[PDB]
């Protein structure tokens, strides 16, 4: 039993756009743009919607780069996160109710203020490798189990 989510990373040649999450789950960490896929939209549609809702930005194209499954101990629903990349943004990022956007240099990624699983998979994305990951968390700080591999098809 799993719930569909999207995550979009805006990755340009020498920088990445992250947003400080201002409220809800994982508030106080720098995240990519995403959320729950709704009834009546495709996964990709949901990714675009979340990006626009959270940052103002629209894009030409999204590229599938990964899938991560998250289990949180004591929560019934697994999270099935479809991860996308883009380097064809249209607009300037702006702050929303949910996210405060900021550009980071690729050697200045704020890992200490990110989800701890990010240290494992985010480098694969920077290296342009497609991946499947699974992370079992106890609360929001502790990884109990994980798997991570590269794949040919996301």
Ligand X SMILES: CCNC(=O)c1cc2c(-c3cccc(Cl)c3)ccnc2[nH]1
Tokens of 73: 């101990």
Taking CB positions, which residue lies at the least distance from ligand X? 115
How many residues belong to the site for ligand X (CB under 6 A)? 15
CA distance 104 to 60: 22
CB under 6 A: which stretch of 40-48, 96-104, 113-121, 126-134 binds ligand X?
A: 113-121
3-62: contacts with ligand X (CB under 6 A): 5, 7, 25-26, 31-32, 34-35
What phi and psi values does residue 43 have, to the nearest 5 degrees? Answer: -60, -45
52-91: contacts with ligand X (CB under 6 A): 70, 81
Give least dist CB 2 to ligand X, A: 13
* Bridge partners for 8 per DSSP: 33, 84
């Amino acid at each position: 039993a799993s719930r569909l989510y999207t995550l979009v990373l805006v990755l340009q040649p020498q920088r990445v756009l992250l947003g400080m999450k201002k409220r809800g789950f994982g508030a106080g960490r720098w995240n990519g743009f995403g959320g729950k896929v709704q009834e009546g939209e495709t996964i990709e549609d949901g990714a675009r919607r979340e990006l626009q809702e959270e940052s103002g930005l629209t894009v030409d194209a999204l590229h599938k780069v990964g899938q991560i499954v998250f289990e949180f101990v004591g929560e019934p629903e697994l999270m099935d996160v479809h991860v996308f990349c883009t380097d064809s943004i249209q607009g300037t990022p702006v702050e929303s109710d949910e996210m405060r956007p900021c550009w980071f240099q690729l050697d200045q990624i704020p890992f200490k203020d990110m989800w701890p699983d990010d240290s494992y998979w985010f480098p694969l994305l920077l290296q342009k490798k497609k991946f499947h990951g699974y992370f079992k968390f106890q609360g929001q700080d502790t990884i109990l189990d994980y798997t991570l591999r590269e794949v040919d098809t996301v």
